[PDB]
Amino acid sequence: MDVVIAVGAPLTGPNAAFGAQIQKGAEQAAKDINAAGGINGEQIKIVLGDDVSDPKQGISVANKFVADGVKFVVGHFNSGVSIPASEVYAENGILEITPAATNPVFTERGLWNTFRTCGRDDQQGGIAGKYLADHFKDAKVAIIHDKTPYGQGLADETKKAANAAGVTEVMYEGVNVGDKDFSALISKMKEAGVSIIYWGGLHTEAGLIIRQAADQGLKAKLVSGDGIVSNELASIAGDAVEGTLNTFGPDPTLRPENKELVEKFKAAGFNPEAYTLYSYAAMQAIAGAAKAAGSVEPEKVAEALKKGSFPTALGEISFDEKGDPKLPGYVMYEWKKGPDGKFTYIQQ
Ligand code: PRO
């Protein structure tokens, strides 16, 4: 009997590019695992659900997944979607491994079923806060967030670390996802002499802020996190994106063992950036743990994940008792023109 595995992701809406990363990564992993004989002899069947980065629609997706006999979910992208969806999964025998949801709460509720292949924002905020102090000790910093669990959570963790290392921000403000006119906020930052904008949120608003700041004459560098890692940031921001900084794990597309896999994606017409290989790795973790458990029962795979080590596109993976992965930590990237002439994030 096929093992039914769902991709729950923002396949449409503002984060569609991230949805594609997650979908393409999981689909390719399923194809590769199937060609190798499947999971414990059984083929993987992929089902898709589009959450539109909307917690309400994410809950409808989770219901559809339960009805369809889903056993494992790779997803979701947004913490605000993943946290509520994970309770549906937890109460209905489904293991959820997110490749991108970073808010600490996701693995801090004592749920048997929650795992990640990505980091978490107390870690990320610690790294970013220290960076702010190490490199911009005397800067006037504005901390701005998007009022979501991810965005404000990250901004708050960073504020805490930055404050402890001696940086006191001159502004702390929230904006709404979907707001597009940042003239007033930018003017306020200019008045306050801001030279660094720390952004807790995703690429859409970051891109709008970067573009508008340059147009309005605010000389400030934007520093953000693992929510801005998409070419779409550059498409919105334009050349003003240059010099933007952000935290993210080591770029898995640069790992030598992934050379052939990255070439395969491109031969299929997809640039497998950012979370693509985190999603691929989530699939591999499920397959590895089922192999170790001698079972595809989600509760048994969960136990196996917490015990063993498994080969993935991110490197050898293992998990703590909360379901967080033991992998390389966050590093700082800068936006510059890559070898292909496009602006992208390059590790400093
Ligand atoms: O948890 C979240 O919502 C964001 C999405 C990309 C990185 N973490």
Domain that holds residue 289: 1-120+250-329
Q: How far is ligand 1, taken at its centre, from the CA of residue 31, in Å? A: 26
Of 52, 96, 226, 345, the one to substitute when testing ligand 1's pocket (max ligand atoms within 8 A of C-beta) is 226
The label of the residue with tokens 């520093």 reads 223
Q: Among residues 239, 212, 209, which one has the least CA distance to residue 227?
A: 209
Angle, CA 332 vertex, CA 25 and CA 318 arms, to 5°: 50
Residues 203 and 337 in one domain: yes
Residues 10 and 145 in one domain: no
Distances (CA, A) of 146 to 2, 102, 152, 168, 179: 40, 15, 6, 20, 9
How many structural domains compose the chain? Answer: 2
Q: Among residues 173, 227, 235, 181, which one has the least CA distance to residue 203?
A: 227
Residues 25 and 87 in one domain: yes
| Alpha-carbon span 75 to 279, nearest angstrom | 8
The label of the residue with tokens 């006037």 reads 140
Residues 201 and 257 in one domain: no
Say which experimental method was used.
Answer: X-ray
The annotation status of 306 as a binding-site residue, yes or no, is yes
Residues 217 and 342 in one domain: yes
Residues 198 and 266 in one domain: no
The annotation status of 319 as a binding-site residue, yes or no, is yes
Work out the widest C-alpha separation in the chain, in whole angstroms.
64
Distances (CA, A) of 196 to 3, 141, 153, 189: 48, 5, 19, 9
46: left (phi over 0), alpha (psi -120 to 50) or beta: beta
Residues 319 and 268 in one domain: yes
Residue nearest to atom 6 of ligand 1 (CA): 227
Residues 243 and 279 in one domain: no
Residues 51 and 64 in one domain: yes
CATH code of the domain covering residue 30: 3.40.50.2300
Q: Which residues line ligand 1 (CB under 6 A)?
A: 77-79, 100-103, 150, 226-227
Angle, to 10 degrees, between the axis of helix 121-135 and the axis of helix 149-164? 40
Are 63 and 40 a contacting pair, CB within 8 Å?
no
Of 22, 51, 78, the one to substitute when testing ligand 1's pocket (max ligand atoms within 8 A of C-beta) is 78
Give the experimental resolution in Å: 1.4
